[PDB]
Symmetry: D2
Subunit: 325 residues, 4 copies
């Protein structure tokens, strides 16, 4: 028995979810003949109020396809320096996609300073290959992107005729925490990546959502990168289950994280950045070893709660920290 | 309700396979903690007599990762012009991996002429970025590569200190049909891609097999291309089931494929496994008879094609004249 | 004191050409303010009957910029397997430009079989990133591309909505040899690369010619690859000189190459196809290559799978007779 | 004639340089048989105290080849966000070379904070393709990179097993201004790009300098990108002339830049930091008023320069030219 607070990616499929997977109807998705994948994508597109959706094996591929579908060779994509697309995806957009990544300083709430983005945007000129895309992240390290800011960024992106992509790997965490609908949070975006394999608890994959044309380009690029699966409907049906059954209960992950951060408050902790299911802490190797020895797992120290974290688990790791001091 | 001879990719997971998936133990594969994936990779590496294995969502990615792990920016990979990596994978190796694809003419048996490969190989020179890889395909359009040729190609690549990669998407078809063990057919290769999502009947994915160092590079690139999954043990366990339970019965696909070609004696040396090649109005009639298939017409048999299906499509062809 | 038959690239600038360079007016080409470059480009574009032209340090960059301006990421370019763009430019179009190179068998006259090309073309589909370009080469190994063939390829390219690019590194050799003007030979093409640094005798560079939009893309890509020079008018003026003064005399290079092939095809032990001598190249085989090259090099005679001898303005009549004697001496 | 303070790239070849070009011996550089190019490369490599040198048509290609020769596919190169390699070369190293560019904040003197560099460095790992290169710039917007800082960065890169590349497009400006020789200033670097087509006054090209192995790779990539010229010895000999004859006189460009800046900073409506005038550049902003009306006014009087107004001095800028644009500014304000 381990208390795994390393990430919400360690979520296991519930028995009800496994049961759903057992009876999932499948087909060849390359021929577009998997009813499970078709259902998830149809449901996903409508849920976010967009035209089309595309199922992919990972959030990394979801973003990778997103940037390559917005930007061609040499074209620019502006994003945060602390964004996952920049920091934790091996710069695949540049290395594989020949896209010019244009990092700008990222703020606490995950916002990019309008002045920084505007200064970063390169025009379509004689010697300048134009910026084409701006990327945002919601949530960003468990923090919710403020909606008034989002509207302003949409305005800036429109001013230069650019596109707007959302890394919403933990979008529904922002939905539940802020109290705004998913429609309201993705309305200013042209494209959205949502991960099904974190808090939502599905075992594999993410969904890329956007316009028909955008998704059409992403689907062709998905084949090239190796994302074109066959009978993925079993996976897709699990992802569909997650969206229908595992969104509301995310509030508990937020509560236990809030309850965890409060208890841990020799530990420096800012409760203002505990807005969803993450707790960031600062005082390292002896601590991790100590915790490891007590069946407690995490990785600035980051603690993430999920559906396989329970009330007693929280109290055990609060005890463990107290004991450590 | 349809007789689907389009591809062996339309294979559905058996109920027994679904049960295996239901009870599969999983974990976060990125942390390497998925017991289902680890088991498949361990079994696969051992089955082919290699050091390590890597589970990926598709055969396209398996090959894509393979040449990029063999060939760095500007470096060359020699393969067949009719090879899947060249013709049917959007040249991802070049576009994404900056690898110089070096297609050579493909022979009847699916082999690459030794003279062509020798002539294609570019040395490590002042203005030449060296060829680093040679790719083969077994099977290729259902045809089995002769083993003496395989050992011989190994000799050629060794002569230039190169690597040898096998697209064995349909390797086990070649195993069953030729009568050689899997070990004998993958021995000349440095790396092997085997597809689990075709004849073997698993719903998703392939296995890339090779040395520890090679797979280590492939595993790093898998993360970049977006192949890094979480609880893929459910998928992996199905792949494990397929390898353990669905290899022997591939002979039936070969039997039904051969009997199909035999039946088309109205109005054959390339029928060695589960494919039948023949040379729009035709498609309309066949579709109307619940018959689905795909310049040259390709008919593919698999575990959801039965004896009555075969004679039914033979009847359609005869009736069509 | 060497007889250099290795290539027509070893051509040195004449004193007249040097004088022209000395008095060349220059400026910052990045600002488009070099009168020498602009003059060469204006003249070059007009000579080939296209809208715009771009001066580049090499024919390799000329072709590299050409396919990348025709083909974006993942898009396809059909070419000959023996074409320079495929065989001798390190596949930069693919490695650097993410262009899908699509080789088809290349014939003797440099033509690509329409059936082979038609079979290679990938449509704009759900899973197929479209072919966008077909590349041809004139001359190809000193051989002239047949003009009737071009019209038919032009037909095919229009039928599939593609572009057509000509590697005319030695185009003016084909002009002199065939008796057709340069305009007639580039008319079916959307874009043309011509090399100034071979038979024409300019010391550096090539010209990429095409539409305004195409060149605009090529000019921006030139900056990225590092081809954007400053006061290149000195080089450009030499190229203008070459185009104005060194085209007609290519007939002599062809004559000396033909007389060379005649002399060597008499000698026993020599295999030589005189039908392949149409311009300034002689391809030959012994009935080993390396011992011959060392033997020739020691006698101040330089050339290079198949033995290739290339004539240019620094080859004279006596030079031809000396290497004929040398082969005779060697055999 | 125009008084062109837009850039030092507009430098024209002197008659002496043109004479040198006329008598330049040439050959096919691809065969390595151009005596003019070989001489320039030999002289240049020794001048910077490195093993080998490579002649290229531009500084962009010099840097482009540099990063790709240090960094393989997916590998990382750390540089300044205000560095030319990042901002003004279309990210060719990334787009063409598949190199992961890693910008960090760049300071006034062109230095990168070591803490920022340490945070940027990715190790050779199971999932991070390692950083391989750190890039610096001297001069940077005409500022001179402090040598003690350089020593510290060398320590950092050795500690992490990285390479160090200098964009020394205006290195010799830093040489004259700081009083340190070119050898001392490039000693900590593994590779150096020097531009011949600016202050040095040669019409075309740059030199990439480094180890034999590094240059051998660069020479191969040069062929691929299209930098392999034939008889470029005429250009190279001009570059050789520039290095031998036009380095010392860079001090005059610096004097005229300072005299220019002093005259303009004595005018109301001008914001000018005289501490940022260390070489041949003067950066100024109006306090206030738009930039474009000033430029149009100046252009109409045969005066040319260029977000922030930048004035660059060179060998075709003379004292009377300087006094004339001060008068024009005075007249305009
Ligand atoms: C914000 C964000 N975006 C994209 C991804 C990539 O998704 P995949 O890992 O499914 O490719 C992650 C994964 N983040 C892992 C973690 O936070 O532990 C993420 O946190
Ligand atoms: C020999 C071969 N190799 C690789 C692949 C690609 O694998 P995925 O499709 O799983 O990515 C295929 C697909 N072949 C499809 C067919 O023959 O119908 C194939 O036939
Ligand atoms: C047909 C053709 N096209 C393009 C090029 C490339 O041009 P540069 O070498 O200027 O980059 C060459 C060079 N051919 C050299 C020879 O055959 O000797 C060529 O022969
Ligand atoms: C610091 C620096 N680095 C590299 C380059 C590129 O060199 P080429 O322009 O020769 O490619 C320049 C040109 N800078 C032009 C200017 O500042 O006006 C530069 O100033």
């Amino acid at each position: 028995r381990y208390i795994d607070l390393r990430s919400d990616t360690v979520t296991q499929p519930t028995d009800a979810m496994r049961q759903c997977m057992l009876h999932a109807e499948v087909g060849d998705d390359v021929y577009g003949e998997d009813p499970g994948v078709n259902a998830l994508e149809a449901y996903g597109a409508d849920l976010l109020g967009k035209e089309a959706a595309l199922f992919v094996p990972s959030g990394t591929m979801s973003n990778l396809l997103a940037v390559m579908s917005h930007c061609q060779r040499g074209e620019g994509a502006v994003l945060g320096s602390a964004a996952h697309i920049y920091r934790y995806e091996a710069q695949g957009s540049a290395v594989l996609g020949s896209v010019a990544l244009q990092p700008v300083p990222m703020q606490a709430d995950g916002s990019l300073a309008l002045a920084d983005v505007r200064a970063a945007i390169a025009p379509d000129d004689v010697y300048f290959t134009p910026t084409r895309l701006v990327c945002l992240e919601n949530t960003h390290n468990g923090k919710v992107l403020p909606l008034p800011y989002l509207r302003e960024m949409r305005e800036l992106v429109d001013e230069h005729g650019l596109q707007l992509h959302l890394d919403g790997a933990r979008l529904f965490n922002a939905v539940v925490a802020s109290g705004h609908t998913v429609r309201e949070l993705v309305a200013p975006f042209d494209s959205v990546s949502i991960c099904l394999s974190k808090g939502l608890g599905a075992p594999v994959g993410s969904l890329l959502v956007g316009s028909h044309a955008f998704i059409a380009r992403a689907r062709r690029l998905r084949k090239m990168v190796g994302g074109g699966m066959r009978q993925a409907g079993i996976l897709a049906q699990a992802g569909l289950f997650a969206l229908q059954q595992h969104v509301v209960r995310l509030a508990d992950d937020h509560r236990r994280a809030r309850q965890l951060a409060e208890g841990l408050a020799g530990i420096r902790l800012d409760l203002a950045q505990v807005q969803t299911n993450m707790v960031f802490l600062q005082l390292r190797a002896p601590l991790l070893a100590f915790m490891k020895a007590r069946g407690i797992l995490f990785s600035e120290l980051r603690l993430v709660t999920h559906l396989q974290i329970h009330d007693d688990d929280i109290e055990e790791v609060i005890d463990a920290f107290t004991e450590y001091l």
